């Protein structure tokens, strides 16, 4: 099994640890962990193209998109590889993350290791927002916390 | 061609940005950038196995060593892949890093993307210390700052 980990940090109180595990190279990736300091409700959750945190989360560039698709939700055929949708924060501001995804990988062409995981200000509209920015970012607002996805033991 | 970048941070004053560039896959990786907050003199400079920053630099594991060799200097045949030797801080505590290495890579089995770059408390003895620890770590002392090596534009 391949394993990866991401420590999410930013300028505010938002912080968390996200784990990735992929049992076989042609099988799904399990993604799980916890993020605290968030407002109650939905928050965009994306893999961005670059593992560059030199100017914070901004230098991570756009959503990881090697097939040159439009933005969508994780269940959509039309999506970026990095489109993992929304995480939900409870009343205390904790988002317990538990996702399975078959588009991202921890090896080969859709490998997300060395790229940036980002958690956003507000809801990802999943490409249904009806403006240009819906097709690109999902209108999920500023980047609250980010980290480079690294190889784990 | 392929580029990577690493933001070095720790609990102390050591901070820096290190760039990686490899123009061809069968070819040397240029490593450069500035690290500040160091004590004047030599500091061990290594790629460690895991891109796991959950417990700081400590969770990064040992030197990246896919060929199960003993620790050495960058010029040695007997070395870990991650053995980049020393960097030198000047009298103002700044290490203007400029290294070229043909053993690390930004692709294939010796790929360092998604692993951790670490700068150490003191000099790497390059495996010439005459104790067991010299052939494991180079007696470079504590891990002062670390970062996950991410894919850059
Ligand atoms: Zn997207
Ligand atoms: Zn070593």
Author numbering:
A (entry chain A), B (entry chain F): 1 to 153
From the paper:
Combinations of mutants yielded crystallographic structures of full-length hCCS in two different conformers complexed with hSOD1; an hCCS domain II truncation complexed with hSOD1; an hCCS domain II homodimer structure at higher resolution than previously available (1.55 Å); and the hSOD1 disulphide knock-out mutant used to promote complexation.
Here, we describe several structures of the hSOD1 activating complex crystallised by inhibiting complex dissociation and aggregation through discerning mutagenesis of cysteines involved in normal and aberrant disulphide bond formation. We recently predicted hSOD1 disulphide sub-loop (amino acids His48–His63) movement on complexation with hCCS based on small-angle x-ray scattering (SAXS) data. This is proven true by our new structures, where it adopts a conformation that could not be accommodated if the hSOD1 disulphide were present. In illustration of this point, a recent nuclear magnetic resonance (NMR) characterisation indicated SOD1 amino acids 49–54 are disordered in the zinc-metalated, disulphide-reduced state.
